[PDB]
From Swiss-Prot:
Cellular localization per UniProt: Nucleus
Protein name listed in UniProt: Mediator of RNA polymerase II transcription subunit 14
Protein purpose: Component of the Mediator complex, a coactivator involved in the regulated transcription of nearly all RNA polymerase II-dependent genes. Mediator functions as a bridge to convey information from gene-specific regulatory proteins to the basal RNA polymerase II transcription machinery. Mediator is recruited to promoters by direct interactions with regulatory proteins and serves as a scaffold for the assembly of a functional preinitiation complex with RNA polymerase II and the general transcription factors.
Full protein segment contained here: 1213 to 1367 of 1454
Tree of life domain: Eukaryota
Stated family: Belongs to the Mediator complex subunit 14 family.
Annotated tissue distribution: Ubiquitous.
Gene giving rise to this polypeptide: MED14
Subunit description: Interacts with GATA1. Component of the Mediator complex, which is composed of MED1, MED4, MED6, MED7, MED8, MED9, MED10, MED11, MED12, MED13, MED13L, MED14, MED15, MED16, MED17, MED18, MED19, MED20, MED21, MED22, MED23, MED24, MED25, MED26, MED27, MED29, MED30, MED31, CCNC, CDK8 and CDC2L6/CDK11. The MED12, MED13, CCNC and CDK8 subunits form a distinct module termed the CDK8 module. Mediator containing the CDK8 module is less active than Mediator lacking this module in supporting transcriptional activation.
Transmembrane portions of the chain: none
Species per Swiss-Prot/TrEMBL record: Homo sapiens (Human)
Length: 133
């Protein structure tokens, strides 16, 4: 968790928007819900974000899939470089991947169906916007 936190600050001081004030939490001022990630206070063993219940599903997806047990940098690159109706489409695909994966959705229309969205990712060895359409 601490090494993902350091990777996150290294990402934010390279390439999104860097505005914050806290004790430990890191805040990233990307538009459509500027984010703030920190470890939990009940267990100290897990990172967590605070950034429309699709977004709650998005923070649980970040907790189980992004800040997660391999702790590799490029998945953090993928999720953070991802972060505007792509929010709705992605979190629909993420409530899918929570209920029913390494990819998120954007809408070529206003829709992210079973098929047929503008699906994107930032891949394993690549980490750049790659598509299913």
């Amino acid at each position: 968790s601490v090494i993902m936190r350091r990777h996150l600050q290294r990402i934010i001081q390279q390439e999104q928007l860097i505005n914050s004030n806290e004790p430990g939490v890191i805040m990233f001022k990307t538009d459509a819900l500027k984010c703030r990630v920190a470890l939990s206070p009940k267990t100290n063993q897990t990172l967590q974000l605070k950034v429309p219940d699709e977004l709650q599903v998005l923070e649980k997806f970040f907790e189980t899939r992004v800040a997660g047990p391999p702790f590799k940098a490029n998945t953090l690159i993928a999720f953070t470089k991802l972060l505007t109706h792509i929010l709705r489409d992605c979190v629909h695909i993420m409530k899918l991947e929570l209920f029913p994966n390494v990819q998120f959705c954007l809408t070529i229309p206003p829709s992210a169906p079973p098929i047929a969205p503008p699906g994107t990712p930032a891949v394993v060895l690549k980490s750049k916007m790659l598509f299913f359409l």
